[PDB]
Amino acid sequence: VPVWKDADTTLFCASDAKAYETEVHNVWATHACVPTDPNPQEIHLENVTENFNMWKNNMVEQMHEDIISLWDQSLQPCVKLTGGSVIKQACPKISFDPIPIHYCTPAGYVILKCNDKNFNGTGPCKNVSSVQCTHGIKPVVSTQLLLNGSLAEEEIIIRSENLTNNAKTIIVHLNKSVEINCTRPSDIRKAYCEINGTKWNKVLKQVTEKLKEHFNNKTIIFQPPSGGDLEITMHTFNCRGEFFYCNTTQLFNNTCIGCNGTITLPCKIKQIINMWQGTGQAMYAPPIDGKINCVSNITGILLTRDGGANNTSNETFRPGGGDMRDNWRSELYKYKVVQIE
Ligand SMILES: *[C@@H]1O[C@H](CO)[C@@H](O)[C@H](O)[C@H]1NC(C)=O
Ligand SMILES: *[C@@H]1O[C@H](CO)[C@@H](O)[C@H](O)[C@H]1NC(C)=O
Ligand SMILES: *[C@@H]1O[C@H](CO)[C@@H](O)[C@H](O)[C@H]1NC(C)=O
Ligand SMILES: *[C@@H]1O[C@H](CO)[C@@H](O)[C@H](O)[C@H]1NC(C)=O
Ligand SMILES: *[C@@H]1O[C@H](CO)[C@@H](O)[C@H](O)[C@H]1NC(C)=O
Ligand SMILES: *[C@@H]1O[C@H](CO)[C@@H](O)[C@H](O)[C@H]1NC(C)=O
Ligand SMILES: *[C@@H]1O[C@H](CO)[C@@H](O)[C@H](O)[C@H]1NC(C)=O
Ligand SMILES: *[C@@H]1O[C@H](CO)[C@@H](O)[C@H](O)[C@H]1NC(C)=O
Ligand SMILES: *[C@@H]1O[C@H](CO)[C@@H](O)[C@H](O)[C@H]1NC(C)=O
Ligand SMILES: *[C@@H]1O[C@H](CO)[C@@H](O)[C@H](O)[C@H]1NC(C)=O
């Protein structure tokens, strides 16, 4: 029966948000999202091939606008420094822990979902189903590393809009998540992250063999970022309200590609940050007393490749990205909205 035309349209959101919670993601979804589909139904689309493009699907920008909305309402800095002004207010300690959000089509439209195990984000898909809503997607803001997302079903996948353009971000979708366990124990700003060295280097070596496949068997080097602001040169993430900055030099080490134990990353909790929203500079209050612990799964990696190296034997890759959209993209690549014609 069904037939369609690809189109863009305004989505709505659904969640399990508990309405008794003071947590901020739950509050936001409690008043800006409906409940989740109590009877979710996925329909296989028989013998259809559908072209997808994760680098040009308007669901990314909608999710982005939502996360901006949530952070503007939820976070309370003591002082905001935007475009030549300075707004001051009260900065209490909030409750912070992202919850999965579902995205759903209005009537006359439907979501398509690519189920090709190794599909790279662009191109034809031969196992296409139709859903009302995406799956639940945690809105985890981070640089350098993708946290608390979804793994690739089969092999590690390299995602890029154009691998030959070195200004285009590369996303690595891992097959196997590696824990990063970060703790500020009871200088109150100093904390550390622990990663399994064995698993990390096994995964990293696999990552460069895949990168070797895509880059004509060339030698693949990892280097740290070549300067910039701390949110660029550090793996940054929010744990329990505190903004964490971690040094990833030990992770992107090439000789391990006597190193087999726990890798310990030095980190600092910052009160003064440069808002990822682009608006400007923000100041929050000193950290919570006692132990501050967050355990997360690395499930993907963000990478930028140097240019001016074509007449070399090497290709060198630094952690990076910057644009938060790619985060959302890393979970929305297998979806696209269509208009039922
Ligand atoms: C298509 O995807 C489904 C769901 O992921 C899975 O059972 C299998 O990989 C494929 N099934 C068929 C019948 O092609
Ligand atoms: C993704 O697959 C298409 C073929 O459908 C191919 O042209 C493109 O190069 C692939 N992208 C990457 C990054 O391998
Ligand atoms: C971490 O990854 C495992 C699968 O490798 C999964 O079972 C677990 O729920 C993940 N934890 C979080 C918080 O996503
Ligand atoms: C991970 O993917 C690599 C190739 O990309 C493969 O060698 C390995 O078997 C995969 N591991 C799992 C657990 O799927
Ligand atoms: C990919 O990027 C390269 C380098 O920027 C560019 O010259 C080329 O035209 C692009 N190719 C495609 C198919 O977009
Ligand atoms: C995380 O690290 C802390 C201190 O380094 C340790 O006490 C705790 O057992 C770790 N938790 C997990 C789940 O690895
Ligand atoms: C790393 O993982 C291995 C299995 O690959 C496990 O035996 C060990 O507990 C882990 N070691 C550390 C230091 O996390
Ligand atoms: C690249 O290397 C792989 C294994 O390392 C090998 O099977 C393949 O022949 C090489 N490809 C080219 C084009 O040389
Ligand atoms: C990370 O640590 C190394 C030494 O371990 C240091 O040289 C480097 O400057 C640090 N990174 C940043 C961004 O400060
Ligand atoms: C990842 O998920 C775990 C369990 O839900 C949570 O404790 C941790 O804070 C999350 N990490 C981030 C960066 O949100």
Numbering used by the authors: 42 to 124, 198 to 300, 325 to 355, 357 to 396, 409 to 492
Article sentences:
The HIV-1 envelope glycoproteins (Env) undergo conformational changes upon interaction of the gp120 exterior glycoprotein with the CD4 receptor. CD4 engages gp120 by introducing its phenylalanine 43 (Phe43) in a cavity (“the Phe43 cavity”) located at the interface between the inner and outer gp120 domains. Small CD4-mimetic compounds (CD4mc) can bind within the Phe43 cavity and trigger conformational changes similar to those induced by CD4. CD4-induced (CD4i) conformational changes in the gp120 inner domain involve three flexible topological layers (layers 1, 2, and 3).
To better understand the molecular basis of this phenomenon, we solved crystal structures of gp12093TH057 corees containing the LM mutations in combination with H375S (LM+HS) or H375T (LM+HT) in their unliganded state. Unliganded structures of the LM+HS and LM+HT cores were solved at 2.2-Å and 2.5-Å resolution, respectively. There is close similarity between the structures of the LM+HS and LM+HT corees. Indeed, alignments showed that they have a root mean square deviation (RMSD) of 0.43 Å for their main chain atoms. Alignments to the wild-type gp12093TH057 coree, resulted in RMSD values of 0.45 Å and 0.54 Å for the LM+HS and LM+HT mutants, respectively, indicating a larger dissimilarity between the LM+HT and wild-type coree structures. Interestingly, a closer look into interactions formed by mutated residues in the LM+HS and LM+HT corees (magnified view) reveals a new network of interactions mediated by Asp474 and Arg476 that stabilize the inner domain mobile layer 2 and 3 interface in the CD4-bound conformation. Asp474 in combination with Glu102 in layer 2 formed a network of hydrogen bonds with Arg476 in both LM mutants that bridged the two layers. The levels of main chain atom B-factors corresponding to the residues in this region are much lower for the LM+HS and LM+HT mutants than for wild-type Env, implying that there is a greater degree of structural stability in this region in the LM mutants. Interestingly, another region of the CD4BS was found to be significantly rigidified in the presence of the LM+HS/T mutations: the V5 loop region (residues 457 to 468). With respect to the issue of why T375 seems especially able to induce susceptibility to CD4mc irrespective of the LM, one clue from the structures presented here offers a possible explanation: space in the Phe43 cavity near S375 is strongly occupied by a density that may represent water or a crystallization solute, and this density is largely lacking for T375; these observations suggest higher susceptibility for T375 because it has fewer solvent molecules to eject in permitting CD4mc binding.
